[PDB]
Structure formats: C-alpha cells, structure tokens
C-alpha cells in the first residue's frame with residue numbers, strides 16, 4: 069500500500085500512544101497500540117515508510133506491521149501492545165507484548181515470537197563505592213572486567229562445566245549457583261521468579277541445545293549485551309532508591325545484560341521447527357512464518373514452555389556467573405571482599421519470555437499466557453509475584469540506554485498493570501540499523517567521543533563499535549519519559565556509565 | 572548484472588599482521604553478498620548465477636559476519652546435508668545446520684561453502700565447506716549469530732537467483 073493508505077489505520081489516542089486499527093494486516097482479532105511521545109513518534113513512522121520502500125525485492129517488515137500480525141494470533145485478548153522501545157524485530161516487534169486467554173482452546177503459544185534469546189535480562193548491582201573511588205583506577209577496573217568476563221563470538225566459560233552440571237542448572241536455576249557457591253542467598257531474593265522456574269524440564273531441552281550451551285555458560289555474549297559500571301546521577305524517588313540500597317548521587321552500580329546464549333537460541337529454534345510440523349496437522353493461519361505456533365495445550369506448546377523455563381534457568385545461572393566474575397574483578401582492583409563492597413543484587417528482570425499470569429480482562433479475572441518480546445514485567449505495588457522488599461515501592465524496572473548516554477531505574481505502577489498487563493521495556497531500542505550506523509558513523513569518532521567523556525571501554529572488536537554507538541539507539545530519556553508520562557512506569561534513579569565491556 | 576542493492580561496505584575485523592599474512596597466501600573468496608538494513612538485527616542478501624550459488628553465498632555471508640573468513644585456512648572439509656518442505660525451510664535449515672557446525676561439536680568455520688546440489692522436487696540439499704576449527708588465537712572476533720529467522724525471508728529462483736534472510740544477532 070501507499071504510505072498515505074497505511075496511515076488510514078493509525079490514530080493518535082493520546083499524547084503518548086497511537087492506535088493501529090483492524091485491517092492494517094489481515095485477520096486482526098484485536099487492535100494494536102504503541103506508546104511513543106513526540107520524539108519517538110517519527111522513528112516509528114519513518115520505519116513504516118522506509119522498511120519496504122520499493123516495488124521490487126528486498127526490504128523488511130516494519131514494527132507496526134509486526135504488531136498487527138501479532139494481533140492476528142488466535143486467543144489474543146485486549147491489544148497487541150508496542151512499548152516505548154518498539155522497533156522492527158523478526159516476528160513480534162522488539163518491545164511487543166501479547167497475552168492469550170489460556171481458557172480459550174484456540175489460544176496459541178508462539179516460540180518464534182517470544183524470541184531466540186529466551187529470558188534475556190538486565191541485572192543491576194550496587195556498591196558502597198563512589199565515583200571518586202573508581203576514577204583513580206577506572207581503566208584498571210575495565211580491564212579487570214574484560215579479563216574476568218569472556219565476551220564475543222567463540223568465547224567459552226573459564227570455570228569447567230560438564231553435562232551433569234548443565235542438567236542441574238537447567239532444573240535449579242539460581243539454586244544451582246547458590247549450591248556451588250557462585251551466588252548469595254540475597255541474590256535469589258531480589259531476582260525475578262526467585263531465579264528459578266520450577267516447571268523447567270531438562271528432558272525438553274534438545275541434545276543440540278545442551279551442546280551449544282555447555283561451552284557458553286559463563287560468557288556474556290555479543291550484540292546488545294554489556295557489563296557496565298555506572299554512577300547514580302539523580303534520584304527521583306528516594307523512598308524506592310532507599311529500598312533498593314541507593315543512598316547518594318555518586319554511588320557506583322553495575323548493570324549486566326545477558327541471556328540464555330546458544331541453549332536458549334536452540335530451544336527456540338527447535339520449537340519453531342516443531343510448530344511448523346504441527347501446523348500441517350492443525351493449520352493455524354499466521355501472517356508471518358516466524359509466528360508459527362500451536363495451541364497452548366498441544367504437546368508442542370507444553371514441551372516448548374517447559375524447555376523455555378529451563379532456558380530461563382540457564383540465563384539466571386549465566387547472569388549469576390557474570391555477577392560472580394564482576395565481584396571478583398572489583399575485589400582484585402580494590403583489594404576488598406565483595407561483601408565489604410556491598411556488591412548486592414538490586415534486581416534481575418527478564419525479557420523474551422512467556423509467563424502464565426492473572427490479569428483482569430473486561431472486569432473478569434483471567435489466566436493469560438503473556439508474551440513479552442523485548443519487554444519486561446512492571447508489576448505494581450502489592451503484587452503477590454514481587455519480593456517482599458519491593459511490595460510497597462513496586463517492581464524495579466531496569467532500562468539500559470547506551471554505553472555513552474544514560475540508564476534508568478523505574479518502578480511498576482498500578483496503571484501499567486491495567487493498561488499494558490504490567491509490561492514495560494528493557495532499554496531504549498534501536499533508531500539506526502547496524503548497516504545504517506556504519507554509513508553514518510566512524511569507529512574512531514565513536515571511541516574518541518567516549519574517551520572525551522571519561523568512559524572506559526573494552527570491546528571484542530573496536531572497528532565495529534559504530535554499530536553499537538549511542539547514536540544508533542533511541543534517546544533513552546525520551547523512552548523513559550514516555551513510560552513515565554503514560555503511567556506505565558515511574559522514574560526512580562538515573563545512572564551514568566563510566567566503564568563498559570561489550571562483545 | 573549488478574545484484575547489490577547498496578554500495579559496498581566491508582566490515583573491518585582489526586586484523587593482526589599474522590592474520591593478514593594467513594589471508595595473503597590463499598586465493599580470495601568471491602563475495603556475492605551484502606549486509607542490509609534491519610532495525611534490530613541484520614538482513615543477509617546473497618546471490619549467484621544458480622540457486623545453489625545463491626544458497627552458498629548466503630552461508631558465506633552468515634560466516635562472514637562472525638569473523639574475517641579470509642583468515643580461515645582450508646585444513647578440513649565438512650559436509651552439510653539437509654531438507655525442508657519448501658525453498659524457504661530448505662534455506663532455513665541449510666543455514667541452521669551450518670550455524671550448528673560452528674556452534675557445537677567441532678566448532679568448525681569454513682572459509683568457503685559450496686552447495687553441490689539442491690533437489691527441488693523433494694527440497695533436499697547437499698553442501699560442503701572447507702576450513703578449520705574456530706580459534707580466538709587465530710581468527711578475529713566479529714558478531715556472534717544467535718539464530719536463523721523467517722522474517723521477510725525471500726527466495727528468488729529465476730534468472731539471477733538471490734535470497735534475503737534476516738538473522739538474529
């Protein structure tokens with residue numbers, strides 16, 4: 069369609085939200101919406117125009133089309149929702165949520181929609197150190213992080229792992245890390261799902277997934293993944309920050325972003341292949357082949373969810389490993405134990421996962437399978453699925469910006485529970501593709517500006533750092549302000565990077 | 572015929588002098604691929620004079636994103652046979668099997684892939700690749716590939732065959 073013919077399905081609901089009306093794509097059961105303020109609005113509509121510009125071959129699906137395609141999946145309730153970090157993905161949009169009524173027998177589960185980086189998450193650690201303590205040893209600390217944390221393609225875990233260790237980690241999650249001494253009991257208490265999904269079945273994880281995951285357990289990954297030393301610059305909610313252990317501007321924190329690695333990628337890949345085979349039996353019509361799905365109660369659906377939970381336990385073990393290695397690096401530089409440095413977990417929250425949750429839909433409580441691609445839980449105060457320390461503040465939300473701008477901590481709100489099924493985002497999202505970033509930016513300009521900002525960097529391939537430049541992502545403040553002004557998340561802390569390691 | 576839709580942008584993997592020397596002594600690989608625009612990830616666009624070559628160039632495009640494959644020595648040859656229900660799933664499984672060769676067991680990376688046959692009546696494929704085990708001491712670090720996706724996947728089997736595949740990174 070022409071660009072103008074597409075806009076006939078787009079209505080601005082309010083200052084921070086747009087409506088995608090039925091008919092945008094075929095067979096929409098519900099409408100689509102996406103939350104963007106003035107600054108983020110242009111990026112989203114320019115993607116609709118420029119994703120498939122010509123009448124020939126090539127191109128990709130813009131996020132609005134993917135939000136609509138998701139709205140066509142059987143069993144969806146309320147809305148297909150794009151969160152402020154929304155941009156084009158491979159099935160679901162990045163920053164796209166969809167919930168399905170589990171008492172609807174036609175309700176499906178989409179493994180290609182959940183994403184391949186199953187249970188990828190952001191973990192925030194705190195310290196009793198200030199920026200003044202780190203600046204004399206900043207470059208040393210970044211190197212110590214780089215030496216302790218394996219990053220990039222081909223990297224392997226330093227601590228040897230065998231198949232039995234992986235089998236136990238798939239079942240136990242953070243309980244395995246606690247048992248083997250790589251995690252503290254306080255880490256589990258302030259981790260989402262307490263770092264373990266009980267219905268995980270290692271027998272639903274393929275031999276291929278286990279062979280890929282075994283060498284990569286204890287590795288950060290690549291792409292958007294990072295381990296970043298940060299400094300508190302502003303405290304918008306002192307009560308929430310105090311509950312999180314943040315006392316003063318200048319306090320040093322560490323933010324870690326990593327997922328299920330090759331095991332989770334294979335689990336999703338294996339499931340997508342099974343769904344395609346199942347759709348020959350029960351032929352569910354989907355607009356995009358990546359959205360291949362099966363009924364939730366189907367054997368394929370149940371096997372995926374159990375393997376997905378095991379991949380989630382893998383990701384919690386990996387992020388515990390990242391925390392253990394981060395604590396070792398801080399200990400070596402400052403010649404002080406990690407406990408004496410107060411290197412505790414503030415929170416661990418995940419994206420790219422489907423969860424069974426209770427939500428009110430049109431006045432009736434219902435049991436929903438909530439798909440969150442590139443988006444996280446943002447549960448309100450007094451929610452039963454939130455640790456006791458955050459019952460009054462609400463669930464902590466971690467939105468990472470870039471290695472050269474800002475990151476934010478927020479809290480879930482009751483209005484977010486009502487409007488988005490308690491969903492918010494995990495980061496700013498991309499404004500430029502990696503390919504477009506190469507055309508607009510030079511690797512030396514990115515490295516130098518970061519040095520001029522006093523940010524220390526260790527990356528696996530410095531001459532590709534332009535593809536991860538701050539100019540490649542949305543303004544994180546505009547994303548965070550959209551969440552705040554829409555009432556789906558509440559600002560608590562603003563952080564500033566001083567050192568980052570990436571792969 | 573020009574099949575590239577963009578001007579050539581060659582990814583720089585920060586080669587050491589020894590790696591530059593390893594690349595210098597083998598014939599250069601003919602590259603019929605490009606990395607195109609996708610907001611969250613990257614779109615592989617590869618082409619050839621046959622459908623077989625379009626497939627093998629896509630695999631080489633995928634491996635070319637993980638490292639400089641010119642630094643890979645042809646010390647061992649590996650076979651990849653797979654099948655699908657159509658050209659898209661054949662392409663999906665072809666790239667997935669090669670990704671698995673790199674990601675597990677022998678951790679093999681080829682400097683070149685050749686598709687020996689594509690059975691278009693049953694959607695089956697035979698291909699080989701020559702190279703060595705991937706090593707951080709020998710090969711530079713590019714970008715790790717998470718998975719193959721069906722997003723906007725396009726297979727054109729006419730006069731100048733070409734494919735478009737978005738991969739998760």
Ligand SMILES: *P(=O)(O)OC[C@H]1O[C@@H](n2cnc3c(=O)[nH]c(N)nc32)[C@H](O)[C@@H]1O
Pocket residue numbers: 153162188292293294296323442468469470471472474475494495496497498536541568570
């Ligand atoms: P999800 O789609 O996994 O994207 C993650 C999210 O993280 C942010 N990001 C990317 N690089 C960095 C970095 O070096 N440091 C921080 N704090 N945050 C980063 C992006 O906003 C991306 O969208």
Ligand SMILES: [Mn+2]
Pocket residue numbers: 185188189292325327419
């Ligand atoms: Mn992630």
Ligand SMILES: [Mn+2]
Pocket residue numbers: 291611612739740
């Ligand atoms: Mn990706």
